[PDB]
């Protein structure tokens, strides 16, 4: 049930670092089929002789590389930053956003040299010391479901942990965690799950964790003295949305009960899509019940790459007033951080 890829592309360069050698170690002892590739972003002879082939079998696949960006994202109104870990996910959410973002590969990648990584971030920790800066690790992955093949997240988390002014979030649709239990954390991480009503879970997240599996692992993190919150996104005005995320919030509060929830976040995430997503989507999921109609919604124009449709003003602040409603009356004192 965790993720275990069914074929490997290495960097030769990553065999340098540790963790490049470990994993070579792991999988060929494990005898899955290794490959090398000369770049991380550019992985040749996936299998598969149509789109959709290479595209499913690209999501069973892991490359393992070295980051040579040396500047971090701003990933805001999350976090100050996001640190790259890893890039991709072995899910098949209908809707996820990654599917249409420049430059964003269907396979998952891991980053070997963690050294560089996390010298990088004490650089922008120190440029604004004493002001706390937020890195967020799953801006462009599912860094959670993939950490059990490289324990980089609990590397970072405890690196995080040691610091003064560096604060680190994170946020999973996989209930695979408990490696992540004893990490010395010290307060400074957030742990946070998507969740969504019962249509947006069983239509759109397939080859996720289930709700009770995502709640489960939320108790488990709570109960290890992480800091919890939740995103709830996409939010999605389906039929019958009112009820459905009424009941979200009501199953939630029961699941979490005996808790304490003085410090619980929540982050609001409205469904959006971009121009390229119908085709992108419709070839990917056939079957989809997704609605991309464009014609029902708000264009949001890009700045230096293409915009974005969400819903219009009235919908969207009828969103926000629902969802602020629900959490203020099953979860008082909760911080609700944003809506977009
Ligand atoms: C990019 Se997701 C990466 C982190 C992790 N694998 C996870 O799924 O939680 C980050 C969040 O953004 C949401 N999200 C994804 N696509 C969309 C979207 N199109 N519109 C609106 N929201 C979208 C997802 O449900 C997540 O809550
Ligand atoms: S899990 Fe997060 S990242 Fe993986 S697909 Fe669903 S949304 Fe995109």
Redesign the pocket.
């Given at each position: 049930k965790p993720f275990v890829p069914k074929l490997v592309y290495f960097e030769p360069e990553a065999l340098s670092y540790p963790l490049g050698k470990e994993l070579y170690e792991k999988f060929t002892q494990m005898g899955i089929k290794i490959r090398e590739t000369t770049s991380h972003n550019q992985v040749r002879g996936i299998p598969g002789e149509t789109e959709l082939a290479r595209y499913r079998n690209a999501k069973s696949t892991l490359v393992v590389g070295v980051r040579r960006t040396l500047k971090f994202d701003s990933c805001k109104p999350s976090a100050e930053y996001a640190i790259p870990l890893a890039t991709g996910?072995m899910?098949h959410?209908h809707?996820?956003?990654?599917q249409t973002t420049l430059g964003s590969k269907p396979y998952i990648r891991v980053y070997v040299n963690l050294d560089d990584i996390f010298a990088q971030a004490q650089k922008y920790i120190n440029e604004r010391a004493p002001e706390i800066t937020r890195f967020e690790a799953?801006?462009?992955?599912?860094?959670?479901?993939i950490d059990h093949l490289t324990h980089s997240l609990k590397k970072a988390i405890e690196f995080i942990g040691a610091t003064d002014y560096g604060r680190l979030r994170?946020?999973?649709?996989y209930e695979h965690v408990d490696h992540l239990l004893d990490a010395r954390h010290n307060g400074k991480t957030r742990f946070?799950?998507?969740i969504?009503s019962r249509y947006v879970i069983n239509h759109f997240e397939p080859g996720?964790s289930s709700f009770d599996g995502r709640l489960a692992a939320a108790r488990k993190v709570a109960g290890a003295g992480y800091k919890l919150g939740f995103?709830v996104?996409?939010?999605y005005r389906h039929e019958g949305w009112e009820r459905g995320y009424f009941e979200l919030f009501q199953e939630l509060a029961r699941q979490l009960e005996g808790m304490d929830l003085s410090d619980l976040t929540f982050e609001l995430?409205?469904?959006?899509?971009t121009k390229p997503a119908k085709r992108v989507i419709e070839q990917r999921y056939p079957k989809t019940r997704l609605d991309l109609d464009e014609t029902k919604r708000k264009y949001k124009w890009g700045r230096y790459g293409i915009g974005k449709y969400v819903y219009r003003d009235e919908e969207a602040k009828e969103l926000e007033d629902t969802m602020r409603r629900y959490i203020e009356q099953f979860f008082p004192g909760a911080y609700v951080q944003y809506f977009t």
């Open positions: 996910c899910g959410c809707y996820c956003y990654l799953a801006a462009t992955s599912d860094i959670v479901g994170f946020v999973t649709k946070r799950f998507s969504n996720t995103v996104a996409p939010i995430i409205q469904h959006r899509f």
